[PDB]
Amino acid sequence: RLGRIRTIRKGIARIMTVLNKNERENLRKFYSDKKLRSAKPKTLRAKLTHRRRLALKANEKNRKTRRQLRMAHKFPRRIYAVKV
Amino acid sequence: KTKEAMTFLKTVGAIDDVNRVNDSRQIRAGRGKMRNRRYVARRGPMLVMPDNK
Amino acid sequence: RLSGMKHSAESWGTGRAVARIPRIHGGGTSMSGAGAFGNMCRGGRMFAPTKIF
Amino acid sequence: VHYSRKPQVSSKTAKAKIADLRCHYKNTFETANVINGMKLRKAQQLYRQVLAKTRCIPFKRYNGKIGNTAQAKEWGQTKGRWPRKSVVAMLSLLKNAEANAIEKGLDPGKMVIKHVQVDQAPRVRRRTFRAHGRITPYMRSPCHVQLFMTQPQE
Amino acid sequence: TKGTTSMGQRHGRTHILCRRCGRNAYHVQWERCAACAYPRAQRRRYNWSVKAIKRRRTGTGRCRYLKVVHRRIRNHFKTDIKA
């Protein structure tokens, strides 16, 4: 109960916290340079639900076909209005 | 303005009945209170609006 | 849904000097054997359970 | 603890009370009683006397099979006992009261007991194994004692 | 006799403690935590014992992480720090 030591250890938490923060992000950077892979381990690459990790990436999902596309061009439907 | 309104209303009537009102307000004795009926009171005179403004 | 109603309790039957009801299953509890399910029992059903319509 | 009976004169009487004593209550009743219990004069001397020169203590309530004794002559009856345990208590009891008679200033050379009130205090539990596995309580009856002493005079 | 001596004979220790769920029911020789059914890669429950099911049903622990999922999801992943 020269109680002050708790804090000091808690200070220890603080360097330590920081430290990895830095390292970790260090790492992250030097992973890239390709759109993918190994850039950056999973533990650098942050969990996000089974489903959330699953999912259709937008390109492949919005990048539908010519048939439709032409069609889409052909049948837009924005505003009309009626009453009289 | 509340006051303006009320006053006339009082003058024109609202005093007793109104005064029963607000003031016959009691904590609901018994358990309804403890099923959240904390207070009770009576009822006093009615103005009908065509609509309020 | 099934308030009260909840031990794996059984009726003990006859010859046992006693009213013939369900009783709590288990020992030590010192609920051990205590009358079960219904109405009359501690924490039990009540008669006529409280219907939805 | 509002113990006992409304007791007179703030001048010359003295109050104590102790609880849950460890002698069998009924029994103790008969212990207490000889001092108190009764009927005035007989109760007063005898406490001064068993307790300052005698043994058998009278009983006349509890039943059982309960032994017969000539000592019961002390009573003209047939029951009294000599049960050690109690006795001890009794002595204590007087005694604080007596030291209080210093502080009240009363004459301890001749104080008198009036109105003791001795009550059943809540009982002690424990268990026993019987054949086939049955179990019974073998329980206990302790004591409440609260005491007053008088000694006005001419 | 029939019983009590034979109560002398209960040095079975029958079922022991478990890994996954602990308690007991661990049959040594045909190896099972009755409970968790460790061995087996899933865990056991049955209907009838519904209460047991409740007794095991998640949260009872601490959903150590999963708990936090609710925060996080609700915290909708605007990500990184503000600075």
């Binding site: 505003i79 209005a81 | - | 849904r1 099934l2 109603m5 359970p49 319509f53 | - | -």
Partner: protein, 55 residues
């Protein structure tokens, strides 16, 4: 039992699947309906708002 000459032997709720201390089960009350009404309404209106240029 009382003497009253009334409309013979009836009344019904004391039949099947009305979940008792058992459980069951096929449940579908309408008490939601206020709320539901609102659910239809509140939504409906609220929908309008969104759509809004549209007949």
């Amino acid at each position: 039992m009382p003497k009253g000459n009334n409309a013979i032997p009836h009344v019904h709720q004391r039949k099947h699947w009305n979940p008792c201390s058992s459980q069951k089960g096929n449940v579908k009350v309408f008490f939601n309906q206020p709320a539901q009404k609102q659910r239809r309404r509140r939504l409906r209106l609220l929908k309008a708002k969104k759509i809004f240029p549209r007949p």
